[PDB]
C-alpha cells in the first residue's frame, strides 16, 4: 500500500533509464521517479502515448499530491491507482489514456560469491563475444572498402574496352577500302602490315577483357563473403544484447551486498 513497495516506483533512476525501459512499448505503460531535482516530496510520472514519453509533475503541497492546483490526493499511490482505472482525459483531454501497464521493478528469476562467480563468467562471455563482433565489423568494413574499389576498377575496364572496341570499328572502316585497293594492285605486303597491326590490336583487347573477367570473378566471390559476414553479424547482435542484459542485473543484484567484490572481480 505504501509508495516504497509499489511496482511502478523506481526511486532515483535516471531519465535516460526510463527512456530505455519505455522504448517501442505500448501506450499506457508508465513509471514513476523521484524528480531529477532529487528534492524531497517531488515526483515525476512518465507514461507512453503516441510513441513518445510524456512527463508529468506530481506536485506536493502540505501532505497531498496532484497534477494541478486542486491537489486532491493524500498519497501518491492513490493518485496512480485512480488513473489506473479512470482516463487521464479527466486531467487533459489531449491525453485520453489510462495507466494500463506498470513496469514492475523485479522480473528475472547460492552464496553471494556464487552469483559473484556467475557474474564473472557471464561478463567474460559478453566481453569476449563483444570482441567477436568488433572483429567482424572491421572485417566487414575492410571487405566493404575492397569491394567498391574493385567495382570502380571494373567500370574502368568497361571504359577502356569501349575505347578499344571503337578502335576496331574505326580500323575496319578506314582499312576496308585501302585493303580492297592493295589487293587488286597486287600489293600483298601493305595488306600484311595492315593486318599485322590489326591482329595486334585484336590481341591486346582480348588481354584486357581477360583481366576484366578475372577481376569480375574475384569480385563476385568477395561480395559473397561480404554477405556472409553480414549474416553472422546479425546473428551475434541479438545474442550480444542478451548477454549484456544478464550482466547488468547480476551487477546490480550484487551491488546490494558486494560493492568491494566487484571492485576486485573486474
Amino acid at each position: 500500500m505504501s509508495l516504497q513497495d509499489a511496482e511502478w516506483y523506481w526511486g532515483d533512476i535516471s531519465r535516460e533509464e526510463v527512456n530505455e525501459k519505455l522504448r517501442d512499448t505500448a501506450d499506457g505503460t508508465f513509471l514513476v521517479r523521484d524528480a531529477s531535482t532529487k528534492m524531497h516530496g517531488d515526483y515525476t510520472l512518465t507514461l507512453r502515448k503516441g510513441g513518445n514519453n510524456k512527463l508529468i509533475k506530481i506536485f506536493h503541497r502540505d501532505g497531498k499530491y496532484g497534477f494541478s492546483d486542486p491537489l486532491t490526493f493524500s498519497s501518491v499511490v492513490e493518485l496512480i491507482n485512480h488513473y489506473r482505472n479512470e482516463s487521464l482525459a479527466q486531467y487533459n483531454p489531449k491525453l485520453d489514456v489510462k495507466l494500463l501497464y506498470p513496469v514492475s521493478k523485479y522480473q528475472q528469476d547460492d552464496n553471494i560469491e556464487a552469483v559473484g562467480k556467475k557474474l564473472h563468467e557471464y561478463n567474460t562471455q559478453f566481453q569476449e563475444k563483444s570482441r567477436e563482433y568488433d572483429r567482424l565489423y572491421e572485417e566487414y568494413t575492410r571487405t566493404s572498402q575492397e569491394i567498391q574499389m574493385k567495382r570502380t576498377a571494373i567500370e574502368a575496364f568497361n571504359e577502356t574496352i569501349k575505347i578499344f572496341e571503337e578502335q576496331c570499328q574505326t580500323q575496319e572502316r578506314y582499312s576496308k577500302e585501302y585493303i580492297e585497293k592493295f589487293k587488286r594492285e597486287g600489293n600483298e605486303k601493305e595488306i600484311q602490315r595492315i593486318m599485322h597491326n590489326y591482329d595486334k590490336l585484336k590481341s591486346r583487347i582480348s588481354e584486357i577483357i581477360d583481366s576484366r573477367r578475372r577481376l569480375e570473378e574475384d569480385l563476385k566471390k568477395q561480395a559473397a563473403e561480404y554477405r556472409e559476414i553480414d549474416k553472422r553479424m546479425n546473428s551475434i547482435k541479438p545474442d550480444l544484447i542478451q548477454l549484456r542484459k544478464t550482466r547488468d542485473q547480476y551487477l546490480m543484484w550484487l551491488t546490494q551486498k558486494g560493492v568491494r567484490q566487484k571492485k576486485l572481480n573486474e
Binding site: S14, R15, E16, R23, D24, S36, T37, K38, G50, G51, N52, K54, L55, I56, K57, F67, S68, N92, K94, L95, Y137, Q148, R151, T152, A153, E155, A156, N158, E159, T160, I163, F164, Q167, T170, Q171, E172, R173, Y174, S175, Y178, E190, R193, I194, N197, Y198, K200, L201, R204, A223, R227, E228, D230, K231, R232, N234, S235, K237, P238, I241, K245
Partner: protein
C-alpha cells in the same frame, strides 16, 4: 593499376584515329606535348598515315583510376601525374570549351571525385542545386572584385581580429598606462638585412596611425613643416601596410591594434609585437587575378494538402538482398514511423512477420495522423528488423522526406536501397540519419508505394496558412516568473506536459523574452495543422536572438523550414566572421540534418566561405575530410564543386595541399601494410629514401599549412623528419619557415601526420578547450590552456601541431632518478622546472603550472575525457602543463569518473616542494582556481550542450543520441543549484584523491 610508381621508361599504347595502334616507349616524366609530337613522328612508320592530320588537330583521352574517360586538354601535364588506369592513349579531336574541361579536372582532383559523375545524376534536385546555387557564387565573386585591389586582399588575407575591441581589464592592466610598444622593421638592402624602429603607442591605434608614428619617429630631425610631415604620413599611409613578421597575416583594415589576435596575445603573453613595413603594391602583386566563369551546366493542375480528407497510408511491398541466417533467426519485419525531427508524430506501426527467405508483405499501413495535419518537415523513418525473452535488432535502415524540395507530396511506387546499421546502435529506427537511398550495389532494396490522390499534391502556400491561423485562433506576475525560469533552464532540460501547454498558452506573452523560443517550439503539437499554423505567425515576427542561441535551432530537434530560416537569418546578421570561424565545425555538421540540398543555411555558409578565405579554407577541409562517407558524399561533393568553382586562385594552392597530403597517406599506407614486417630502424632508412625522390620533394615543399594557411611550409628538414615510436607509427615532419623574417616567429614548423585513428574527437575537445579558456580569460581567470592545432583531412587521417620545447611528464620522470624501490622520484618534475626556471622566474613557472593545471582538471572532469597518464600529460619548458590524445569523452565505455588525478609529482610543484602539500596555502589557492573555473562553465553550459548536440549526426560513436550528452549534465549538475554543484565537484575531487577536498 596497383603500381606505386612508373619505371623510368614505360611502353604506352597509342590508338591512332586511322585504326592503327603504336607501342611508344617514353619517359615517365614526359609531358603529353612530347608524347603527341613523338607519336606522330613514329606514326609515319605505320600504314594509313595519309589519313592522319597534323598533331595540332588532336588531343589524348584515356581512362583514369577513377574510371573517368578524361580528355587531356592540359597537354602540359606529366605522364606519371595523369592517374592512368592503363598505359594507353586514344587520339581524338578536341570538342567543347577547353577552359571548362581543364578546370573541371583540377576541381575533381580537389574535391576527390570526377565532376562528370554529377552530370549523370537522375535526381532533379541534384541538377537544380548545382544550377541554382551559382547565384551565391557570382554575388560573392562580384562582392570581392568590387573595390579592387583592396577588396581582393581583404578576401585572401582577411583581418584576424577578436569579436570586440574592448580589452578585458585583465589584459588592459598589462599595458603601460594603456600603451603598447612595437618594433617595426624594414628590409633595406638587396642582401636583405633589416632595420628596426621601436615605437610606443596607444593600444587602440589603427594600423594607419601606427604608420603615422613610425614616419614621425624617422623624420624627427628633418625639420618638416607641420603640413610637410602630413604629406609624408599620407604617402606612407597610402603606400605601405603592416605585416606580422614570420607569417602571412596583414593588418589591412582599420581595427584598433589591440583586437588583432596576434597583438592581443602579445599583450596577454607580454611578448614584443614584431611587424614588417611592406609596400602594399608588393602585396597586391602576389594576388593574381581570378574570375568565375559560369559553368556549362548553367543553361538549358494541382491541389492542396489541406483538401485531402483521409488518414496517412503507406504500402510496404517487398525487399531484396536481405542478409540473415535463415536457421539462426525466426522471421523479419519492417518497422515504420512518422517523425518530425526526433519526435514521432504518431505511434509507430509494423508489417506482419514473415519468413526470412521470402521478404514480401504487400501491406497497406495506416497511421494515426490526418494528412492535412502533416507538418512540412514530416519524414518517414523505417528499417528491416529481425526477431529471435523476445529480442529485436535492426538489419538496415532508411529515411524518406514525405515532401520533396518542390513542396510536393510523394506519390506512387518508390524503391529505397537501405543503409547498414551504425556500429553500436541498438535502436530499431534511425531518425537522425540522412534521408536518401544507398548508392551501393547489392544493398537490400525495400519497395514502397504512396497514395495517389488523382493529382500532384502541394504543401499550402504561406498565404493560406496565415488565413487558417486567424481562423483557428478565433475558435500575471507568478506567470512571468515561470517564463523567465523556464528560459533559464538548459536546452536538454525536462519540460513537463504541464509546462508545455503553459508555454503554448502564453505563446503571445513569450515574445517579450525572445530566447524562450526553443522551449516554446518544443511545446507545439506539430501533428496538428492548427497549432503549427499559429506558430508560423509567431516566428514570422519573432525578435531575433543571439547566434549562440539560434545555433540550437539548427540541430536535429528543429527541422521545420520556418524555424531554421529564422535561425539562419539570426546568424547572417549577428554571427561575426570570428565566431563563425570558431563554430564552423558544428555549422557544417548540421547541414546533414537539412532535408534538401538547397536551403538557407548552406547558402549562408557558402557565401561567407567565398567572401572570407580564412573560413573558406576550413570550409573546404571539413567537407573534403568527410567525402569518403557515402551517406553525405553527394551533398558535400556538389557543395565542394560550387566552392572550388568560385573560390578563386586559392584552388591552385588547395591542390598542392591535397597532393601533398595524398603522398603522405600513400607513403604511410605502404609503411603500415606493404612494409609492415619491419621495425623502426629499418623503416627509417626506407622513409628517407622515398623522401629523397624529386617528385616527393617538389610536392611536399613550398605549400601552405592546412592547420593554418598563414604558415608557409618551405623546404623539408629531412634530418629532422622521422617515424615516431608509437603503435600506429605516425610521421614527425619539420619544414623550414621561408618568411623573410622567420627568425622573429619560428624557423621550425613541426607537424605530425597521423593515419590510423579518428581525429575528430580531438578537434571537438580541442575546440571545446579553446572555448572554456576564452571565457575564463574574459572572467578574470588566467588559466592558460593549449588547444594545439588538430585537423582531420580524411578517413582516420589528419595533422597535429606539435608544441615546441615540451615533454611528457614520463619523459621528465626518466630524466631524474629513483627513490623508492623501483619507483621514480616524485620530486623529479619540480627539480626539472627549478632547473629551467632558476631565479626570480621560478615563482612564475609555478604560477603558470598551477593555473594551467587547474584548467585541465576542470576541463577533463566536465568532459569525461579518457584516463590521463604520464605519457599523455605534457609540460612545457615554460612550465605550462597540457594534455594530448583526447581519445574518448563523455565516458564512452563500460560511476562518475575523474580522469586527471593529481599525483604527488604535481602537488610538490604547486606547493613548491613542501611536505604537507594539501595543507599549504599554495594548494588552497589552487583549489580556489578550480572552483571558480568549474562554476564558470556551469553558467555557460547551454552553448556547450548545443555544441555537442549539433555533432550527433557526425557519426562519432562517443555520442550517438541526446542521452550521451547527459554525461555533461551530470558533471555540471545542471539539475541542481550552484551550491549543490560546488559541493558535488568537491565530492568527486575528494573521492578521486582520497581527501583534501
Amino acid at each position: 593499376w596497383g603500381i606505386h610508381l612508373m619505371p623510368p621508361r614505360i611502353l604506352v599504347e597509342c590508338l591512332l584515329p586511322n585504326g592503327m595502334i603504336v607501342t611508344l616507349e617514353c619517359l615517365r616524366e614526359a609531358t603529353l606535348i612530347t608524347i603527341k609530337h613523338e607519336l606522330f613522328k613514329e606514326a609515319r612508320k605505320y600504314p594509313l598515315h595519309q589519313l592522319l592530320q597534323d598533331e595540332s588537330s588532336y588531343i589524348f583521352v584515356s581512362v583514369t583510376q577513377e574510371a573517368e574517360r578524361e580528355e587531356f586538354f592540359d597537354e602540359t601535364r606529366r605522364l606519371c601525374d595523369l592517374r592512368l588506369f592503363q598505359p594507353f592513349l586514344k587520339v581524338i579531336e578536341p570538342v567543347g570549351n577547353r577552359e571548362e574541361k581543364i578546370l573541371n579536372r583540377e576541381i575533381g582532383f580537389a574535391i576527390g571525385m570526377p565532376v562528370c559523375e554529377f552530370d549523370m545524376v537522375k535526381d532533379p534536385e541534384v541538377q537544380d542545386f548545382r544550377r541554382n546555387i551559382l547565384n551565391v557564387c557570382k554575388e560573392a565573386v562580384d562582392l570581392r572584385d568590387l573595390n579592387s585591389p583592396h577588396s581582393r586582399a581583404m578576401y585572401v588575407y582577411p583581418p584576424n581580429v577578436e569579436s570586440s575591441p574592448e580589452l578585458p581589464k585583465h589584459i588592459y592592466n598589462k599595458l603601460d598606462k594603456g600603451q603598447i610598444i612595437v618594433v617595426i622593421w624594414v628590409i633595406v638592402s638587396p642582401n636583405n638585412d633589416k632595420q628596426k624602429y621601436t615605437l610606443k603607442i596607444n593600444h587602440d591605434c589603427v594600423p594607419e596611425q601606427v604608420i603615422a608614428e613610425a614616419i614621425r619617429k624617422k623624420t624627427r630631425s628633418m625639420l618638416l613643416s607641420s603640413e610637410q610631415l602630413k604629406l609624408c604620413v599620407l604617402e606612407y599611409q597610402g603606400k605601405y601596410i603592416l605585416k606580422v613578421c614570420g607569417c602571412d597575416e596583414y593588418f589591412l583594415e582599420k581595427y584598433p591594434l589591440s583586437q588583432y589576435k596576434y597583438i592581443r596575445s602579445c599583450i596577454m603573453l607580454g611578448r614584443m609585437p614584431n611587424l614588417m613595413l611592406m609596400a602594399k603594391e608588393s602585396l597586391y602583386s602576389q594576388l593574381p587575378m581570378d574570375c568565375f566563369t559560369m559553368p556549362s551546366y548553367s543553361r538549358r493542375s494541382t491541389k492542396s494538402l489541406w483538401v485531402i480528407n483521409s488518414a496517412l497510408r503507406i504500402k510496404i511491398l517487398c525487399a531484396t538482398y536481405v542478409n540473415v541466417n535463415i536457421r539462426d533467426i525466426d522471421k523479419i519485419y519492417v518497422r515504420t514511423g512518422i517523425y518530425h525531427g526526433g519526435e514521432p508524430l504518431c505511434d509507430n506501426v509494423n508489417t506482419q512477420r514473415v519468413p526470412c527467405s521470402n521478404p514480401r508483405w504487400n501491406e497497406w499501413l495506416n497511421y494515426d495522423i490526418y494528412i492535412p495535419d502533416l507538418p512540412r518537415a514530416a519524414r518517414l523513418c523505417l528499417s528491416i528488423c529481425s526477431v529471435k525473452k523476445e529480442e529485436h535488432c535492426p538489419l538496415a535502415w532508411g529515411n524518406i522526406n514525405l515532401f520533396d524540395y518542390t513542396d510536393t507530396l510523394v506519390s506512387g511506387k518508390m524503391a529505397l536501397n537501405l543503409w547498414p546499421v551504425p556500429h553500436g546502435l541498438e535502436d530499431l529506427l534511425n531518425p537522425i540519419g540522412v534521408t536518401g537511398s544507398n548508392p551501393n550495389k547489392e544493398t537490400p532494396c525495400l519497395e514502397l508505394e504512396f497514395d495517389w490522390f488523382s493529382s500532384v499534391v502541394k504543401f499550402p502556400d504561406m498565404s493560406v496558412i496565415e488565413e487558417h491561423a486567424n481562423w483557428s485562433v478565433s475558435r500575471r506576475e507568478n506567470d512571468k516568473e515561470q517564463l523567465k525560469a523556464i528560459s533559464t533552464r538548459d536546452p536538454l532540460s525536462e519540460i513537463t506536459e504541464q509546462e508545455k501547454d503553459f508555454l503554448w498558452s502564453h505563446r503571445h506573452y513569450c515574445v517579450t523574452i525572445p530566447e524562450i523560443l526553443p522551449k516554446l517550439l518544443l511545446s507545439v503539437k506539430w501533428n496538428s495543422r492548427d497549432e503549427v499554423a499559429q506558430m508560423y505567425c509567431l516566428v514570422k515576427d519573432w525578435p531575433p536572438i543571439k547566434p549562440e542561441q539560434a545555433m540550437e535551432l539548427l540541430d536535429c530537434n528543429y527541422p521545420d523550414p520556418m524555424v531554421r530560416g529564422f535561425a539562419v537569418r539570426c546568424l547572417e546578421k549577428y554571427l561575426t566572421d570570428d565566431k563563425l570561424s570558431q563554430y564552423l565545425i558544428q555549422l557544417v555538421q548540421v547541414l546533414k540534418y537539412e532535408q534538401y540540398l538547397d536551403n538557407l543555411l548552406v547558402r549562408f555558409l557558402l557565401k561567407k566561405a567565398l567572401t572570407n578565405q580564412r573560413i573558406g579554407h576550413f570550409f573546404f577541409w571539413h567537407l573534403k575530410s568527410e567525402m569518403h562517407n557515402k551517406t553525405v558524399s553527394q551533398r558535400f561533393g556538389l557543395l565542394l564543386e560550387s566552392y572550388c568553382r568560385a573560390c578563386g586562385m586559392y584552388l591552385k594552392h588547395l591542390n598542392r595541399q591535397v597532393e601533398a597530403m595524398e603522398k603522405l597517406i600513400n607513403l604511410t599506407d605502404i609503411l603500415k601494410q606493404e612494409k609492415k614486417d619491419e621495425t623502426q630502424k629499418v623503416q627509417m632508412k626506407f622513409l628517407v629514401e622515398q623522401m629523397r625522390r624529386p617528385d616527393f620533394m617538389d610536392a611536399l615543399q613550398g605549400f601552405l599549412s592546412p592547420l593554418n594557411p598563414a604558415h608557409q611550409l618551405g623546404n623539408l628538414r629531412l634530418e629532422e623528419c622521422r617515424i615516431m615510436s608509437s603503435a600506429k607509427r605516425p610521421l614527425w615532419l619539420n619544414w623550414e619557415n621561408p618568411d623573410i623574417m622567420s627568425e622573429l616567429l619560428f624557423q621550425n614548423n613541426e607537424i605530425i601526420f597521423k593515419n590510423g585513428d579518428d581525429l575528430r574527437q580531438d578537434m571537438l575537445t580541442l575546440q571545446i578547450i579553446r572555448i572554456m579558456e576564452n571565457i575564463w580569460q574574459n572572467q578574470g581567470l588566467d588559466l592558460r590552456m593549449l588547444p594545439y592545432g588538430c585537423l582531420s583531412i580524411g578517413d582516420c587521417v589528419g595533422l597535429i601541431e606539435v608544441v615546441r620545447n615540451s615533454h611528457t611528464i614520463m619523459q621528465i620522470q626518466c630524466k631524474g632518478g629513483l627513490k623508492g624501490a623501483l619507483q621514480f622520484n616524485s620530486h623529479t618534475l619540480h627539480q626539472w622546472l627549478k632547473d629551467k626556471n632558476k631565479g626570480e622566474i621560478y615563482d612564475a613557472a609555478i604560477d603558470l603550472f598551477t593555473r594551467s593545471c587547474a584548467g585541465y582538471c576542470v576541463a577533463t572532469f566536465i568532459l569525461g575525457i579518457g584516463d590521463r597518464h604520464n605519457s599523455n600529460i605534457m609540460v612545457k619548458d615554460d612550465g605550462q602543463l597540457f594534455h594530448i590524445d583526447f581519445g574518448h569523452f563523455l565516458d564512452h565505455k563500460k560511476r562518475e569518473r575523474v580522469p586527471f588525478v593529481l599525483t604527488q609529482d604535481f602537488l610538490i610543484v604547486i606547493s613548491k616542494g613542501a611536505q604537507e602539500c594539501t595543507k599549504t596555502r599554495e594548494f588552497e589557492r589552487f583549489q580556489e582556481m578550480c572552483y571558480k573555473a568549474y562554476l564558470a562553465i556551469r553558467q555557460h553550459a547551454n552553448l556547450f550542450i548545443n555544441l555537442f548536440s549539433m555533432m550527433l549526426g557526425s557519426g562519432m560513436p562517443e555520442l550517438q543520441s541526446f542521452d550521451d550528452i547527459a554525461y555533461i549534465r551530470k558533471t555540471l549538475a545542471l539539475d541542481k543549484t550552484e551550491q549543490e554543484a560546488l559541493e558535488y565537484f568537491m565530492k568527486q575531487m575528494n573521492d578521486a584523491h582520497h581527501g583534501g577536498w
